[PDB]
Structure formats: structure tokens, C-alpha cells
Design a binder for this molecule. Structure first.
Ligand SMILES: [Mg+2]
Ligand SMILES: [Mg+2]
Ligand SMILES: [Mg+2]
Ligand SMILES: [Mg+2]
Ligand SMILES: [Mg+2]
Lengths: 74, 104, 136, 177, 53
RNA sequence: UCACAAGGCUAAACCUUAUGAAACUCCGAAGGGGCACGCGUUUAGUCCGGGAGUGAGGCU
RNA sequence: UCCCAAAAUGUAACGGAGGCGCCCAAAGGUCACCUCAAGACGGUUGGAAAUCGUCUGUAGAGCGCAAAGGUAGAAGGUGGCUUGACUGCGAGACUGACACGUCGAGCAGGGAGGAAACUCGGGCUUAGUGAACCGGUGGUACCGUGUGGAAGGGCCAUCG
RNA sequence: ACCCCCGUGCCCAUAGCACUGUGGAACCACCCCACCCCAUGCCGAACUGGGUCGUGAAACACAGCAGCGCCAAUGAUACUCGGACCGCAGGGUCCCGGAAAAGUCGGUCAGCGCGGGGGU
């Protein structure tokens, strides 16, 4: 009644076809909404983040297994 | 039940390792022990006991490891890692290990 | 008429009919020409009327069920909360929605029972026969 | 421990009349399962050792205690606490206990015209209604505590109950007559 | 964080020749006798800490 | 998942037929957001530092 | 924590519902293995539910708690060893007016489990909390009013 | 080169299940025995260890098969960005693009690699 006014935040912090950097956060999530690909590490709270620097692109597989990955730039 | 293989396989990191995947198939007294790359659908070396180890049965373990090790160094290898299926450790598969590892 | 289990509250909103045929379950139906709420009564009213027309009818089919808890100002003001858990339960109707349908009775019996059912309704209505079969 | 009458006679029995595909097609015995009903209404943490004693003495094999299913229904129940005992019998030991019963414990029983012939496991397995624990050669009232009873399930590879009955019968299973 | 009449406790640490605190939530409830673990002081580490105060 | 209309079946279940949903979702737009490019016309932007006011809004 | 929240984020109400002020020396680390709820046939204490067996069985179960997400290749269910519920650090980011808050590769000292690649700076995550001040205690040896000490203070823990 | 088998990937249901016909000494599987390595909170069922005969039964492999799943058009619609209006209100229409869900027409019982073993 109503007694939670805090937003957390979530969403997706770095989208697809986006230049990223190493240590950036590509996503904030509750469970694993999508899992990590190559280039990607994952913290305690899930939260896919970047190992390397590059172009972050998305792979959406078969409805409910999804993946964020980092392809090279150079 | 068949999740043992899927577990042990998904455990081993394909890409982020950089290394290579040495499989083993222990089924009949015939075995495989083929060594696969991670990424490219291809396979690097792959020795086997598949034909004529000449009376050796599970003792051929060392041999089929030994062979592979040699056959490995041919293309060259940097510390490939061990992908088994269900089959865990000790006598049978540990000999293929102690052979192909330390034999190169 | 009344629901036995729920979440207990609601909003409100409207758009064109979805969940009713032109016809099913009998020969002649009754269709709403206007969007509105129908109370637990007005059906009870219409059920008891159509029934009080032909006894051993025997087909009275009410395809509308109210589950819409609505509330009311108990006595007064705004200092307080949302209120009135049990005031009345409506259903929501919208044109093309077929509220009632009957059969086993005459053509004229349907005409007149639907006419008596017409009043006691917050909405305009009308009656038809069957062209259409979508699924069965 | 037989296995000779197991092979031969049981197999061609159905091969010489209605025919059959192969020697491996013919039904075989997978395991014998002994489940000791305990706990709930009758539960003793002291008599656990009793039932385990008898059980371990009869089958030449150590018994294993079950648990609760993580349920509380109405009456006595909880997440876990021993509700009963289990012993699985396979191979030589299965046949030990089996000949033990059939050759001795089966004929010796109260008012015994047989055990129920009707379909037990539609898929071709078999169950038993064993009541008294004292009807065995391996358990008598010479040395005892109280009176209880055990349950036994027979698993076979039989495809139907018709292939069950005739199978288990030649092994010395009598039927209600 | 907060404290009062209650069970458990927070003790911290102490040990041979190192002088140091791990500062760890313990408990007196289910199992408490030794609060004992292995930890790293100003030494090479490699040393056992007895967390009973 | 909760609600629910008729019939069958021997009251859950189960099938035929038929619906409701802010806290249901097998599905799912129009639109919205981020990035890049300008492939196109435009003009504002950011940073440092001085001075503010404002922190009662109103209607459609 | 859901809904309201108009498919980014955010968003009010004396709006609609429900939790928290903990717990776990193992519910942590790692390694190794295990797979659920339910239904139908048959069984001794049973005869709605126990326990056993056969059969079906992407979850209809479980996850210490509220709920949402997430989970079956486990995050679930057992054991082996254990104490990374570490010390000195923090590339780079999410988030916030600030103050806080969160995620974190990689580096060293040193350990843990594994044969191994490796994982480990508490717990599937998201609540279990409280700036500053003034004090309690253990370490340190920086200041110390002429000087050498000591009192008092500082700095690292840390308790109220 | 072609048949086929064992391992292993990409694809992760238009590749899944059911019904099922073929396959046995090449490969696979049961079955085989196990004091001992190793293990079973009880049983070598599972791990695991020693090897054939035996059958291809069961499992796995291949093939027929579209009863079930799964994918699924065109047309038309629901809704809607923008533009312009009606009705006191609930609510509604017109122009203009975008445009589903479901259902029907259908579509399938996969496809693309790598290494090795054994046939013609
Ligand atoms: Mg305002
Ligand atoms: Mg939002
Ligand atoms: Mg929005
Ligand atoms: Mg003050
Ligand atoms: Mg408009």
C-alpha cells in the first residue's frame, strides 16, 4: 500500500551493433534473460558485461535461449 | 543418465579457452580417443584402437594414448584438454591420459 | 451470477465485441447494440422474465456471466482509501456480443420473450437467425 | 541356484507352439524388490534395528531406509523421517532369496491355495502380497520380537502378463485353485 | 548489523603470532564449539586462526 | 494461473461446445528507445567560469 | 516483489496485493555423482495422501524466506575434501542532485578443490538496514608543546 | 569415388513422438564372469574391472509412414503512427501509411560439415 517506490533499474545497457569497451555492462537482468557469448562475462546478479573491446551483437535463438556476444573491431 | 556426457561436454569451454578438445569414446573394447578442435567443425589428429591392437584389450589404453600423443606432435599441440563422455576416471581412461599426456 | 473466488478489484475500458458469436447453442439469439455493464440483476431479471414466459421452454442460455467487482462510496468524502469490496458484480457487453440465446420454442415465442427481455436492459438489443458457422 | 531350468525349458515352451523370434526375446527376471512397510501408523526408531535385523538376516544383504516425500498431508507426516525400508536383490542374491521363498516359504503359508493369478503389472512385471514374516525358513518364532510382514515386487522383461504367468509358474509359482 | 539480547554473534579473529581480525558472523545455535578456520596475517599466511574470543 | 456458460462421461479429472483477465500469456503490432551512417535539409550542441530566478501551476 | 506504468528508462495517489530488520559452519569453496510434481495398474502397518515397483512425465516440482525473473547440460537432490564468508588492488562501466549503492576483467602475496582446462575476494539473483559525532577493545609505532620518556592524540582493524 | 558404420559438430521440433520394416559378427549393444583397481546412503542395476560364444531380442542405426505434434501462407480483419471529425457521455467514424493474433491453403517427418573404421 503501495510501499515500494524504488525502480531498481534494469533494461539492456548496450544494444546490438554498438561499439563497446572492455568492462562495459551490456545488460542488467533478473535471471539469465539471455546468456553470455564470447567476449562476455557475467557477475553475481547476472548482468552480462564485456571481457574485451568490440562490436556487441545479438543472437536470438529459438525463443528463450538468447545470447549477447562481442565480435572484433580492429 | 545421458546427461553425463552433455554435462562434461558443456563444462569444457569451447572458445574462451583457446585450447583444443581431446575426446575419448569407451564403448566396446574398441575405443576412439579422437581429438577435435573447438571451433572449426574439423578434427586435428585423432588416433584410435579401432582396428588391430593385437590382443591388448583395456591394456591397449596406454598404447592408443601413446599413439595419439605422437600423432599429435605431428601437427603440434599446446596442452589440449580432456573431454570424456560418461566415463569418469581411474583404470581405463586414466591410462589413455597418462599416455597421451606426458607422451608429448 | 456471482463469482466464488478472485483477486477482488478492477479498472474499466472498452472496444468492439470479441467473445461471442452471432449464434450458438440454439435457434434465436439476442445481441447488444451498445457497450455497457450488465449487473448480476438485469440478467437475473432477464432470466426470470424469459423463463416466466415459456415454462418447459426449455432452452434458456445466458452466455454472459458477470465477474467485474465494482465499488461504491460507502457514505462520504475522499479521506480514506478505495472502498466497497462488495457493491455489485457486472459483466461487460459490446456490440455483437450475444447475451442470451434460446430454442425449443416458437419463432413468435422467441420474438416476444426477447421483447420482454429488451426492457430491463441498460442497452439497446435485437434478435437474429443463423447464417454463420465458424467453428463447431 | 538353478539358472539351468531358467534357460532351456521356459524359453522353448512358447517357441514350440506359437513360435518365437529368438532366445533373447523370451522373458527374463530383472530384479526382486523387497520393500518393508514401516513408520506412519506404526513407527519405531528402536524397531528400525529389528526390521533391518530380520531383513539383513534373510536376504544376505544390507537394508536401506527410505524417507518422507517432503509432504505433510493431514495425519502424521513431514519433509523427511523414515517411513520404511528397502532391499534390492539382483543376480546370485536375487536367486538366493527367490529359491529360499519358492522352495520353502511359498508352500508354507496360512490357508495357502496359491497367490493371486490375475494381472499385476499390465506391462509384464509382477507383484506380491506377502503377509506374515514368520512363514519363512529363514525367520521363525524361535527367535523373534513382534509380528510384522514384508512386501516383494518381481520385475521381468515379459511384454505381457500372459508371458509373465507361464514364466513365473515353471519357477514354482502356484496359482489360486 | 543491529544487536541485542539475541543468539549467534559476531566475533572477528585472533591467532598465533599474527594479530588480525577476520570480522565474521558466527553462530552459537546449531553448531558452536570451535569458531576455528585458516587465514592470512602480516605473515606468509598459511596460518590457523582460532576465532573463539 | 484464477474465473466461468451448456452438454457428455462414471465431484476433481476427462471429451464436445462456449467465454473472462491490471496483478494470466502460445502469440503480438502500430509506435518508442539505443547505436551507426548521412547516403540529406538544417542549425543547434558540449566544456570552463560570473550572475540568476524557479521549486503553488492551469486548462484541453 | 508484482500491478497501475500508455511493449526503452522513469513516473503520482490516505491506488490495487504481499514481504524485510534474517538465516545457513554449511544452505559457502570445489570436485564427484544424482533428476523432479502428478497420474494409471499391483502390492504387508494400506485401502484420498504413506513406503515399493512398472508406465507416462520440459517442469505441471524443487530453489531457507515475499513475489517476479530465472532455472533440466542446474541455480535443484546426496557425498569427498575443505575455509576465496581471504590481504594489498582495482581496467572499465551501470545508477544517483549529492551522499551512498551495484557489476567487474585483469595484477601480486598466498592458499582450496580438481588428474585436468580451471573455478574461488560468501551465499540463483533482487530485502536482512543506518552518514557524521563521542566513546569500548586489539594491532601499529606517525605526533607528543625545551629535551629523553610517559599521559593524550593519530593511523589499521574494529564493538556501541 | 560410391555404400555403410563409430565418434563428433553446425542447426538447437518444417529436425519430436507414436506405429513400425530392415540391420549382427565390420562397427554397437545387451548378455558374460568380477576376490581384487573402483564403487554401491541397499544391490556391480549405475559407476567400474576381465572377455567370447549368444542372439539384433531390448537399446542404438537406417527406412517406410504425414494419425498427433511442429512450421504455416493469400485474402480479409483487430489494433495503430500521422491527418481530419462526431457524440452530453459511454463511445464512434473518415483519409493515409504500418499492420498482426487466430483460422483456412499448405508444408514436412530435416538439412549442412569434420575425422576415423569397414564394404563394392
Ligand atoms: Mg503537475
Ligand atoms: Mg516500463
Ligand atoms: Mg513506455
Ligand atoms: Mg554533533
Ligand atoms: Mg489519430
Amino acid at each position: 500500500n503501495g510501499r515500494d517506490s524504488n525502480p531498481k533499474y534494469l533494461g539492456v545497457k548496450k544494444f546490438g551493433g554498438e561499439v563497446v569497451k572492455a568492462g562495459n555492462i551490456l545488460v542488467r537482468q533478473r535471471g539469465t534473460k539471455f546468456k553470455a557469448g564470447q567476449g562476455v562475462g557475467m557477475g553475481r546478479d547476472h548482468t552480462l558485461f564485456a571481457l574485451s573491446d568490440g562490436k556487441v551483437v545479438f543472437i536470438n535463438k529459438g525463443k528463450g535461449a538468447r545470447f549477447i556476444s562481442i565480435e572484433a573491431a580492429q | 543418465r545421458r546427461k553425463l556426457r552433455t554435462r562434461r561436454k558443456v563444462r569444457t569451454t569451447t572458445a574462451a579457452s583457446g585450447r583444443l578438445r581431446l575426446s575419448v569414446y569407451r564403448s566396446s573394447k574398441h575405443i576412439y580417443a579422437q581429438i577435435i578442435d573447438d571451433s572449426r567443425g574439423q578434427t586435428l589428429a585423432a588416433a584410435s584402437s579401432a582396428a588391430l591392437k593385437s590382443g591388448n584389450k583395456t591394456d591397449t589404453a596406454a598404447a592408443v594414448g601413446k599413439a595419439l600423443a605422437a600423432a599429435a606432435a605431428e601437427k603440434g599441440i599446446k596442452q589440449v584438454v580432456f573431454d570424456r563422455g560418461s566415463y569418469k576416471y581411474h583404470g581405463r581412461v586414466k591410462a589413455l591420459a597418462d599416455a597421451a599426456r606426458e607422451g608429448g | 451470477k456471482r463469482t466464488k473466488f478472485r483477486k477482488q478489484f478492477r479498472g474499466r475500458m472498452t472496444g468492439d465485441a470479441k467473445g461471442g458469436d452471432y449464434v450458438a447453442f440454439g435457434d434465436y439469439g439476442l445481441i447488444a447494440m451498445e457497450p455497457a455493464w450488465i449487473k448480476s440483476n438485469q440478467i437475473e431479471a432477464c432470466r426470470i422474465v424469459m423463463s416466466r414466459h415459456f415454462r418447459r421452454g426449455g432452452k434458456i442460455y445466458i452466455r454472459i456471466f458477470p465477474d467485474k467487482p465494482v465499488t461504491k462510496k460507502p457514505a462520504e468524502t475522499r479521506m480514506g482509501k478505495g472502498k466497497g469490496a462488495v457493491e455489485y458484480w457486472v459483466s461487460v457487453v459490446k456490440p455483437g456480443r450475444v447475451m442470451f440465446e434460446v430454442a425449443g420454442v416458437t419463432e413468435e415465442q422467441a420474438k416476444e420473450a426477447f421483447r420482454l427481455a429488451g426492457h430491463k436492459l441498460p442497452i439497446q438489443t435485437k434478435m437474429v437467425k443463423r447464417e454463420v458457422y465458424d467453428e463447431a | 541356484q538353478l539358472k539351468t531350468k531358467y534357460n532351456d525349458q521356459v524359453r522353448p515352451a512358447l517357441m514350440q507352439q506359437f513360435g518365437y523370434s529368438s532366445v533373447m526375446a523370451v522373458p527374463r527376471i530383472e530384479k526382486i524388490v523387497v520393500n518393508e512397510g514401516l513408520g506412519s501408523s506404526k513407527e519405531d526408531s528402536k524397531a528400525i534395528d529389528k526390521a533391518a535385523k530380520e531383513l539383513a538376516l534373510i536376504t544376505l544383504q544390507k537394508p536401506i531406509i527410505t524417507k518422507a516425500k517432503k509432504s505433510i498431508s493431514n495425519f502424521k507426516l513431514r519433509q523427511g523421517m523414515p517411513v520404511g525400508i528397502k532391499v534390492t536383490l539382483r543376480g546370485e542374491r536375487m536367486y538366493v532369496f527367490l529359491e529360499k521363498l519358492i522352495n520353502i516359504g511359498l508352500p508354507r503359508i496360512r490357508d495357502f491355495r496359491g497367490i493371486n493369478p490375475n494381472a499385476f503389472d499390465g506391462r509384464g512385471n509382477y507383484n506380491l502380497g506377502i503377509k506374515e514374516q514368520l512363514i519363512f525358513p529363514e525367520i521363525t518364532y524361535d527367535m523373534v520380537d513382534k509380528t510384522r510382514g514384508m512386501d516383494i515386487t518381481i520385475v521381468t522383461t515379459a511384454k505381457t502378463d500372459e508371458e509373465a504367468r507361464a514364466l513365473l509358474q515353471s519357477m514354482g509359482l502356484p496359482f489360486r485353485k | 548489523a543491529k544487536d541485542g539480547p539475541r543468539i549467534i554473534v559476531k566475533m572477528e579473529s585472533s591467532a598465533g603470532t599474527g594479530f588480525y581480525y577476520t570480522t565474521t558472523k558466527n553462530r552459537r545455535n546449531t553448531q558452536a564449539k570451535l569458531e576455528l578456520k585458516k587465514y592470512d596475517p602480516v605473515a606468509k599466511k598459511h596460518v590457523v586462526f582460532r576465532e573463539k574470543k
